[PDB]
Each structure stands twice: as C-alpha cells, then as structure tokens.
Amino acid sequence: RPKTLFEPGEMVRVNDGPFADFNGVVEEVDYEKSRLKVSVSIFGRATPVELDFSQVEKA
Amino acid sequence: NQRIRIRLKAFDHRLIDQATAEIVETAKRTGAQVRGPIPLPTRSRTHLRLVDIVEPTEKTVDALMRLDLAAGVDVQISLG
C-alpha cells in the first residue's frame, strides 16, 4: 500500500527499469504530469531521473 | 515508445568524448538505436553532449548500469 504523498527532499525507492533496487530523493515533483523528479546515486554521482509513482516506492 | 535521454557534462573534453563513445557502443551492442550524439556549445568551460537511445531493451538498461563511467563526467539520464 505505497503512499502517493511525495514532497521535495523526500527519499523514494526505485523498483523498475535499470534504476530498480536504488533509492534517491525527489528534488522536484509534477502531479499534473504524474512524474517525480528523483536522482539516483549511481557511480557516486546523483542521476536525476523522472519515475512514476508506481515505478518508485515512498521511503 | 520510450526513449533514454542522456546529457553529459565535463570540464575535460577527452573524458566526455570517451564516455559518449562508450554509451553509444553499449547501446548499439544491445540491439538499441542511437540518436545523436551531438555537442552543444561549451558553457562556462563545460563541455556538453546529448545522446538518446531509442528502442531500448532490458539488455540495454542492464548494459548501461554495468558500464563504469569515468570520474569527471556527469551523466543525467531519463527513461520515458
């Protein structure tokens, strides 16, 4: 029962696509476009990617 | 109908062109297609490249994850 309440600075979880099994924070959110702006710490660098609410889980 | 969009930045043009080549090779060996890469004008001594991967497969995504990108190159990546 994942929550759809996400806010800037909130950590999220990715379980779909190559970013699956990775966590990150949502710097920007887009309820109108139904997309969350969260980056994944890959290679030691943040990777700001857009994931859907179901594509990622609230942390 | 999804695309992987990648933007690269680096202060060292040698690193950015090597990373770009590595991404292209990984995509193509993957059964995916490449659009670009293109260079943008250098801004604040920062080199910039854009490249997209169309018709990505699971093998493409996995190959990109495995790829070790050099220190000193920033890669922003999205899928949609």
Best B53, B62, B76 member to test A by mutation, with max A CBs in 10 Å, is B76
Inter-residue contact A7 to A48 (CB < 8 Å): no
**Cβ contact (<8 Å) for B61 and A48?**
no
Q: Out of 3.40.50.10950, 3.40.50.150, 3.30.70.600, 3.40.718.10, which CATH number does the structure's domain B1-80 have?
A: 3.30.70.600
Q: Around B25, how many Cα atoms within 13 Å sit in the side-chain half-sphere?
A: 8
The span from the CA of A35 to the CA of A29, in Å, is 7
Alpha-carbon gap, residue A16 to A25, rounded angstroms: 16
* Domains within chain A, CATH numbers bracketed: 1-59 (2.30.30.30)
- Per-residue burial over A22-35, b if 16 or more Cβ lie within 10 Å, else e, is bebbbeebeeeeeb
Cα–Cα distance, B32 to B26 (Å, whole number): 9
- Partners of A40 in the β-ladder: A24, A47
Domain spans of chain B?
1-80
Write out the H or E segment, with its range, that includes residue B14: helix B13-28
Which residues 2-41 of B are in CB contact (within 8 Å) with A? Answer: none
- Experimental determination technique: NMR
